[PDB]
Swiss-Prot record, chain A:
Protein name (Swiss-Prot/TrEMBL): Large ribosomal subunit protein uL16
GO terms for cellular component: cytosolic large ribosomal subunit
Molecular function in Gene Ontology: rRNA binding; structural constituent of ribosome; tRNA binding
Entry superkingdom: Bacteria
NCBIfam families membership: rplP_bact
Organism: Thermus thermophilus (strain ATCC 27634 / DSM 579 / HB8)
Function: This protein binds directly to 23S rRNA. Interacts with the A site tRNA.
Subunit structure and binding partners: Part of the 50S ribosomal subunit.
HAMAP family linked: Ribosomal_uL16
Keyword entries, A-Z: Ribonucleoprotein, Ribosomal protein, RNA-binding, rRNA-binding, tRNA-binding
Curated annotation (Swiss-Prot), chain C:
Coiled-coil boundaries: none
Cited function: Required for accurate and efficient protein synthesis under certain stress conditions. May act as a fidelity factor of the translation reaction, by catalyzing a one-codon backward translocation of tRNAs on improperly translocated ribosomes. Back-translocation proceeds from a post-translocation (POST) complex to a pre-translocation (PRE) complex, thus giving elongation factor G a second chance to translocate the tRNAs correctly. Binds to ribosomes in a GTP-dependent manner.
Family listed: Belongs to the TRAFAC class translation factor GTPase superfamily. Classic translation factor GTPase family. LepA subfamily.
Compartment(s): Cell inner membrane
Organism, scientific name: Thermus thermophilus (strain ATCC 27634 / DSM 579 / HB8)
Included stretch of the parent chain: 306 to 599 of 610
Gene this protein is translated from: lepA
Protein name: Elongation factor 4
UniProtKB/Swiss-Prot annotation, chain D:
Alphabetical keyword list: Ribonucleoprotein, Ribosomal protein, RNA-binding, rRNA-binding
Full protein: residues contained: 4 to 133 of 173
Gene Ontology CC entries for this record: ribonucleoprotein complex; ribosome
Subunit structure: Part of the 50S ribosomal subunit. Forms part of the ribosomal stalk which helps the ribosome interact with GTP-bound translation factors. Forms a heptameric L10(L12)2(L12)2(L12)2 complex, where L10 forms an elongated spine to which 3 L12 dimers bind in a sequential fashion.
Species of the source: Thermus thermophilus (strain ATCC 27634 / DSM 579 / HB8)
A GO BP annotation: translation
Record's function text: Forms part of the ribosomal stalk, playing a central role in the interaction of the ribosome with GTP-bound translation factors.
This protein's name: Large ribosomal subunit protein uL10
Post-translational modification (record): The N-terminus is blocked.
Keyword Ribonucleoprotein in annotation: yes
Entry similarity comment: Belongs to the universal ribosomal protein uL10 family.
MF (Gene Ontology): large ribosomal subunit rRNA binding
Spans through the membrane: none
Keyword Cytoplasm assigned: no
Curated annotation (Swiss-Prot), chain G:
Task of the protein: This is one of 3 proteins that mediate the attachment of the 5S rRNA onto the large ribosomal subunit.
One Gene Ontology CC term in the entry: cytosolic large ribosomal subunit
Highest rank taxon of the organism: Bacteria
Record-linked CDD domains: Ribosomal_L25_TL5_CTC
NCBIfam families associated with the record: bL25_bact_ctc (TIGR00731)
Biological process according to GO: translation
GO molecular function, one term: structural constituent of ribosome
InterPro entries assigned: Rbsml_bL25/Gln-tRNA_synth_N, Ribosomal_bL25/Gln-tRNA_synth, Ribosomal_bL25_b-dom, Ribosomal_bL25_C, Ribosomal_bL25_long, Ribosomal_L25_dom, Ribosomal_uL5_bac-type
Similarity comment: Belongs to the bacterial ribosomal protein bL25 family. CTC subfamily.
Stated name of the protein: Large ribosomal subunit protein bL25
Record keywords: Ribonucleoprotein, Ribosomal protein, RNA-binding, rRNA-binding
Subunit structure: Part of the 50S ribosomal subunit. Contacts the 5S rRNA; has been isolated in a complex with 5S rRNA and uL5, 5S rRNA and DNA binding protein II; 5S rRNA and uL18; 5S rRNA, uL5 and DNA binding protein II.
Length: 136, 37, 289, 130, 174, 134, 180
RNA sequence: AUGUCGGCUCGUCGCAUCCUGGGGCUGAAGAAGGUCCCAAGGGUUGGGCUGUUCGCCCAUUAAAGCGGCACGCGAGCUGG
RNA sequence: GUGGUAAAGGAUGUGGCGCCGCGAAGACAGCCAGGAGGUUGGCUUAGAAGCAGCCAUCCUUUAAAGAGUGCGUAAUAGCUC
């Protein structure tokens, strides 16, 4: 997990549309139906990837956790104001592209992606360097 | 051996089969008799 | 194994049949001699049932024991080993076990299926000579451990070869091999420990068995004591007994998640305070033998 | 690619360098069993391509290029495509004649050939072991 | 392609009828029900089945038609029959008259009559094969008599078809 | 009987207890201990797999004049190939030039089918699979 | 090499309707020599994947006219992939937007033994090369070992005479998988 | 004014079955199993303790089900 | 009987799509028969003389070449393509 030194502790809640694009090693996943995504899901992800790639294959990470998440009580009646944290979601609106080479050749990239992105809340699609981009 | 979803073919010689709204995967090996229905 | 009463007319001789007496192991129930189980799987059951519903009373049925001839630095080797004399490895090295080499006469191909079974305790071949006379039958010789051949060798060997040929040990020439130690750490005060030998690391398939005894009705209010298999390294198994507790929060059926929170500390803080006075005293009651 | 490109091309390439090509039904023996006769002229001399094992359609239309003007004494069915031409045929042929005849049950019946210039006779090939 | 040309030599008396084509051989009149939109005509020995259109239905049914009528002609041509092979000493079998002896349920009045064009050739309890005519009711029967004790996934002991080598699992040990 | 079956073994030794065992008496062989003859014959020729097809027969066939060694390891024997005894044969034991390996085919091509023209790099080039030098 | 049927329209409903027809809207533009031109997808899309394409020069043929050009942009969709809007840059005399594919063909030393991975970094570069553009710049290295990453300095430029880039800059890298 | 726990008496219902049936698979020889599938027709006792449902505990038994039903049922009881 | 109420999921459902498959010197499934000889060890040689087990990337037949996938085991042996 990660997110150290936030400057606040109660972000609101929005979400609707945006994103990024390119592969950065060239087999990355990319989300379709957009959602929060907590760090737990990430440890599960990069672990499924790792253990499938000979426990060391090269996984660029990707997105990263930020907005705090909280239920607040235990079942206590709401009234008091909003506090505590336990989730720490990153937001992934569609088109965000998780970055996952491993030089691991062809299918294993694909398959490790199958597991990994299937260890996650949202339906996803597998892609790589393709329609390209350039500027300066 | 109902697994009522999944059904991923594994005996590899395995046959897949629809029939009466079901998807039995019949294999020459008995173990693989998966049935999502 | 008797449970209790020793001697009691050591009915050994009786009438013919590979009799047995004396030479009993201790560990945690002496029981004097542990013989009375020669020949096939019948002579043992028959005799055991004989004095049972004939003369003898409620007897035991423990398995076989060993010796272990460790080699403690500055002289040791033997030192008379006992299912409790475990002096750790401070005795320098080990070298204790009866590596007897028997001659199996398996013909046809009973070897293939048997050769794998003989691996009960890391065995090996010595002289593989094709029997003469003609064919059918055969021969076999290994160096298994008399400790891994005593109990469960014939009834299992006869099934692997349809029950053909025979088998006879030689009990000659000692050996070292891995042994290890396994002691069941009940609650946390450690008692008897039972253990075994850990020779070659076998407690595993036995640890998660002897320990996870479900706890002989040892709940004690709400001790929750965890029964772990303390052999000789941190922890091997992990058997924790269930506590008791009381439907404390069963009268405040109302609102406010604060009320049901108070009637929870008295039960949580208390359960711990108890984990000090008494521990666990559940030995008898038909041990998990 | 699909057409004459994979072996097919060279198939009648070197074979055309000669002028006395031959054919046989040899095949129907276990790989070793007629491996034993998979080096007849190859022992009788060297560099033979006996039992080339192309056949009809694969060479039956490619026989016209070859300009043997009709090697069709064996082209149908099984056809070893064994060239008596690779050797200078004479004494060596017996080393392939005994090899396909003496062996087994129906060791290797011949189809025909184009021995010499004119096509070899179906019987005369059988007739002239040497 | 290979969905139309049926050979029916012999001396057959096949003839079409409104979706209910018929066959008359040496002893059978074995029926051949079919779906009319496919439809067939036959002459001499050539047999001319036809495809109304190529949605998957009509093609697939087409293949039925050719197969089923083919089974008609081949079927009545002899009086078609299926091989069978009991094995494993837990048995006996005998023709008896118009039902089979059998002997393997140990309390064994395991009687079994032929139904129809079926009749039982009892040649050696180690064989006992059954005559019939139409292949599919031959199958209904072979299935019926094979319905009693065929598998023995450990050691061979039961009724069998022509015979697998018969897959096994290792016995009690070894 | 007719144990004249085909059963290869290891060249040049003595007690064949690890290979024989059920490859002799088991089928219906006879006697034992032509250990010496295995020495007396094959301890000499070809450290390149020189086993004599224990032609099963009355009185138990004898040794001497096996058939031939075959295998690539006869067709290119001048080496040994101890490598891989630990690991998957990294490197080493692979060169006495291309050349001593070829000159060794002048007599390392005993009995084989009819006879092909070459037993060097038109077969040692199958030892290209067999060895380490592809 | 392709063509590019011209279209008058500018901005409105039309580009959307055309995408509904499968037909990239696009641009012909160069040093203020301007026109708006509207490509069809599909084959022009294979063309698009032809790698040298979107890099190496591509020709296109508005009605019967001929022009050379090399793509300056491709607006992607974000909601999904697929290109939304191509931008061309036809070549008059001097082009400088040069978007050159590299072909480092590393000699073995790291990936095979130490297991370290040769991660591509910049993939493709920005140099200057008027109508003579070199294809695959080839910078072999046996420095796969040690976890070094050779920078931009080492390319040793073939007659495409310029490094626009600030010299020496991790053009291609290796990263340890678990450090050796 | 919507008499609130528990017991009795009566119940009927569903199935996510405890038994009874019917079948796959096995690391199933047989028997005893394990485990999932189809299965609601019937059956699911007698006690000790406590207000207790709950829970352990004796004796077994084919089993000793889980739930609904205003935590079923006080214009019908008891009221601990 | 979807319509006349639910997801991750899996599915040679089915209709139609734009690429991908012809090798009439004739593929595809079925076949028919041959599936290789030196192609046989590195360690285990208890077996690797492939398909116990921790590398074998080139020549023979060229039908193609299985460095060999598969049964299997002491290997082998006899078995798909």
């Amino acid at each position: 997990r990660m997110k150290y030194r936030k400057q606040q502790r109660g972000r609101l809640k929005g979400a609707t549309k945006g994103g990024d694009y390119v592969a950065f090693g060239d087999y990355g996943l990319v989300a379709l139906e957009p959602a929060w995504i907590t760090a737990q899901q990430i440890e599960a992800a990069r672990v499924a990837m790792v253990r499938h790639f000979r426990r060391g294959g090269k996984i660029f990470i990707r997105i990263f956790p930020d907005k705090p998440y909280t239920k607040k009580p235990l079942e206590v009646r709401m009234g008091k104001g909003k506090g505590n944290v336990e989730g720490y979601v990153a937001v992934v609106k569609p088109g965000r592209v998780m970055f996952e080479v491993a030089g691991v050749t062809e299918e294993q990239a694909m398959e490790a992606l199958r597991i990994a992105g299937h260890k996650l809340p949202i339906k996803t699609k597998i892609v790589r360097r393709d329609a390209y981009d350039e500027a300066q | 051996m109902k697994v009522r979803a999944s059904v991923k073919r594994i005996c590899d010689k395995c046959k897949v089969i629809r029939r009466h709204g079901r998807v039995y995967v019949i294999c020459e090996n008995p173990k693989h008799k998966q049935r999502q229905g | 194994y008797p449970v209790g009463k020793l001697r009691d007319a050591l009915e050994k001789l009786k009438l013919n049949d590979a009799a047995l007496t004396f030479e009993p192991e201790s560990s945690t129930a002496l029981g004097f001699g542990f013989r009375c189980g020669f020949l096939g799987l019948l002579h043992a059951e028959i005799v055991q049932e004989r004095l049972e519903r004939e003369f003898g009373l409620s007897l035991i049925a423990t398995a076989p024991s060993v010796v272990y001839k460790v080699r403690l630095k500055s002289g040791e080797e033997v030192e008379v080993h006992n299912p409790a004399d475990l002096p750790d490895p401070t005795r320098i090295e080990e070298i204790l076990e009866p590596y007897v080499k028997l001659t199996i006469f398996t013909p046809e191909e009973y070897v293939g299926s048997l050769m794998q079974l003989l691996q009960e305790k890391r065995g090996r071949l010595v002289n593989m000579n094709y029997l003469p006379g003609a064919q059918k039958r055969v021969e076999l010789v290994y160096e298994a451990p008399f400790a891994e051949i005593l109990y469960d060798f014939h009834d299992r060997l006869k099934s692997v070869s349809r029950g053909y040929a025979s088998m006879d040990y030689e009990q000659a020439g000692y050996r070292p091999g891995d042994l290890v130690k396994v002691n069941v750490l009940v609650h946390g005060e450690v008692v008897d420990a039972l253990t075994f030998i850990a020779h070659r690391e076998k407690a595993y398939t036995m640890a998660r068995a002897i320990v996870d005894k479900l706890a002989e009705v040892i709940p004690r209010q709400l001790f929750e004591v965890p029964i772990q298999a303390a052999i000789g390294g941190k922890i091997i198994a992990r058997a924790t007994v269930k506590a008791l507790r009381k439907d404390v929060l069963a009268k405040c059926y109302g609102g406010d998640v604060t009320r049901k929170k108070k009637l929870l500390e008295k039960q949580k803080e208390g359960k711990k305070r108890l984990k000090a006075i008494g521990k666990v005293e559940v030995p008898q009651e038909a041990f998990l033998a | 690619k699909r057409n004459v490109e994979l072996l097919a091309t060279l198939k009648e390439n070197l074979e055309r360098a000669q002028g006395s090509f031959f054919l046989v039904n040899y095949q129907g023996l276990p790989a070793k069993e007629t491996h034993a006769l998979r080096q007849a002229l190859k022992q009788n001399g060297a560099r033979l391509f006996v039992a080339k094992n192309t056949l009809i359609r694969l060479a039956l239309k490619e026989l016209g290029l070859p300009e043997l003007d009709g090697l069709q004494g064996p082209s149908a069915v099984v056809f070893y495509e064994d060239p008596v031409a690779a050797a200078k045929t004479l004494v060596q042929f017996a080393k392939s004649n005994p090899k396909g005849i003496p062996q087994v049950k129906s060791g290797l019946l011949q189809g025909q050939i184009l021995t010499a210039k004119d096509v070899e006779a179906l019987a005369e090939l059988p007739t002239m072991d040497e | 392609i290979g969905r139309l040309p049926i050979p029916v030599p012999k001396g057959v008396s096949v003839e079409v009828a409104p979706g209910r084509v018929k066959v008359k051989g040496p002893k059978g009149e074995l029926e051949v029900p079919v779906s009319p939109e496919m439809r067939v005509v036959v002459e001499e020995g050539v047999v001319r089945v036809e495809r109304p259109s190529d949605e998957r239905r009509h093609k697939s049914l087409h293949g039925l038609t050719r197969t089923l009528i083919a089974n008609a002609v081949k079927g009545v041509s002899e009086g078609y029959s299926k091989e069978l092979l009991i094995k494993g000493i837990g048995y006996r079998a005998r023709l008896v008259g118009r039902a089979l002896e059998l002997t393997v349920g140990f309390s064994h009045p395991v009687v079994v009559e032929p139904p129809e064009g079926i009749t039982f050739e009892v040649p050696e309890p180690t064989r006992v094969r059954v005559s019939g005519i139409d292949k599919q009711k031959v199958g209904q029967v072979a299935a019926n008599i094979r319905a009693i004790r065929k598998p023995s996934a450990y050691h061979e002991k039961g009724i069998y078809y022509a015979g697998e080598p018969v897959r096994l699992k290792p016995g009690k040990a070894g | 009987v007719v144990a004249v079956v085909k059963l290869q073994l290891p060249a040049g030794k003595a007690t064949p207890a690890p290979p024989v065992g059920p490859a002799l008496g088991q089928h219906g062989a006879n006697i034992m201990e032509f250990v010496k003859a295995f020495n007396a014959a094959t301890a000499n020729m070809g450290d390149a797999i020189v086993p004599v097809e224990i032609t099963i027969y009355a009185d138990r066939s004898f040794t001497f004049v096996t058939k031939t060694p075959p295998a690539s390891y006869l067709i290119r024997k001048a080496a040994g190939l101890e490598k891989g005894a630990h690991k998957p044969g990294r490197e080493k034991v692979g060169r006495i030039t291309w050349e001593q390996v070829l000159e060794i085919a002048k007599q390392k091509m005993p009995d084989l089918n009819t006879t092909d023209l070459e037993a060097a790099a038109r077969m040692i080039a199958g030892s290209a699979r067999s060895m380490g030098v592809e | 090499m392709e063509y590019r049927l011209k279209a008058y329209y500018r901005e409105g409903e039309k580009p959307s309707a055309l995408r509904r027809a499968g037909k990239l809207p696009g641009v012909m533009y160069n040093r203020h020599l301007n026109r708006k031109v509207y490509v069809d997808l599909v084959e022009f899309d294979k063309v698009f994947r032809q790698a040298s394409i979107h890099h190496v020069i591509v020709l296109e043929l508005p009605d019967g006219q001929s022009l050379p050009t090399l793509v300056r942009q491709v607006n992607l969709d974000k909601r999904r992939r697929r290109p939304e809007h191509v931008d061309f840059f036809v070549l008059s005399d001097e082009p400088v937007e040069m978007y050159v594919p590299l072909r480092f063909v590393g000699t073995p030393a790291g990936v095979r033994a130490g297991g370290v991975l040769q991660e591509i970094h910049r993939d493709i570069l920005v140099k200057v090369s008027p109508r003579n553009i070199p294809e695959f710049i080839e910078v072999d290295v046996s420095g796969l070992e040690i976890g070094d990453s050779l920078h931009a300095s080492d390319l040793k430029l073939p007659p495409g005479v310029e490094l626009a880039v600030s010299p020496e800059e991790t053009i291609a890298a290796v990263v340890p998988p678990e450090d050796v």
